[PDB]
């Protein structure tokens, strides 16, 4: 949902009237579920990794 | 004036012997000696009847820590020189210099440390998230002070008794003015 962070890190839900009066941006954050994968292999010549 | 005289708990001094010392021989021959060559490039010992710890280096410099007073450090250095003489080396008191004196004292009232740091801010630096004691660096003499809300004041970085005594005498009226509850 639309929100705004303040100077001191306080984040509260932002409404368009408050956004218009305070010169803020009526925006919503985007999050992604990032998954990290680490693979290891024995590196020897003549053999497929 | 002050109602209580601060007492010392650690005096650190150094003595140069003017001789070359082998760390392995004094590590093996001495009884209460420890040597970790992979960690520290010196041998470490201590004695109980002054309860003082000696940092013995290879260049003849050695450091005495844990002395309550000056005469305790003097007798500790005397017995350390006796240990070096009796262990198989020649040493002499070429130069002995006291370089650090600490002390602790109590005022027995709470001190508003925030107002102290607000008033005497040019000599003090406060960071309670790292250490709860205020660090005060007074310009004359060169004594640093650790201040606590329980009234326990720790004076550190002295060479003799007059500088630490006058440091406490100067810090007493600027600290007794703060009262809590």
């Amino acid at each position: 949902k639309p929100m705004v962070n303040e100077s001191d890190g306080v984040t509260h839900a932002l409404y368009p009237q408050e956004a218009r009066l305070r010169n803020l941006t009526y925006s919503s954050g985007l999050f992604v579920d990032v998954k990290k994968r680490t693979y290891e292999a024995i590196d020897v010549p003549g053999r497929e990794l | 004036t002050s109602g209580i005289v601060p007492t010392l708990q650690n005096i650190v001094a150094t003595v140069t012997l003017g001789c070359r010392l082998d760390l392995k021989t004094v590590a093996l021959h001495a009884r209460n000696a420890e040597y970790n060559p992979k960690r520290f490039a010196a041998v470490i010992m201590r004695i109980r009847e002054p309860k003082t710890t000696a940092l013995i280096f290879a260049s003849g410099k050695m450091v005495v820590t844990g002395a309550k007073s000056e005469d305790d450090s003097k007798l500790a250095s005397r017995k350390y020189a006796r240990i070096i003489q009796k262990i198989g080396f020649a040493a002499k008191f070429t130069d002995f210099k006291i370089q650090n004196i600490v002390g602790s004292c109590d005022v027995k009232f709470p001190i508003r440390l925030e107002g102290l740091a607000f008033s005497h801010g040019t000599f003090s630096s406060y960071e309670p998230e790292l250490f709860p004691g205020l660090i005060y660096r007074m310009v004359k003499p060169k004594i640093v002070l650790l201040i606590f809300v329980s009234g326990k004041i720790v004076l550190t970085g002295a060479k003799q008794r007059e500088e630490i005594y006058q440091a406490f005498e100067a810090i007493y009226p600027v600290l007794s003015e703060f009262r809590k509850m």
Partner: protein, 50 residues
């Protein structure tokens, strides 16, 4: 459809930028796992060295 987070916005911003929650994942912590190896040695006599 895309998923809309119906919880409080502050909970979502807890993990944002300044977050005093410390990072705990071991992904690409190469600086941590190769700064733990330290070499220490002393002055042994020259003959065995030679």
């Amino acid at each position: 459809r895309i998923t809309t987070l119906d919880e409080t916005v502050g909970v979502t911003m807890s993990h944002t930028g300044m977050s005093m929650r410390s990072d705990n994942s071991n992904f690409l912590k190469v600086g941590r796992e190769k700064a733990k190896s330290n070499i220490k040695s002393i002055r042994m006599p020259k003959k065995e060295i030679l």
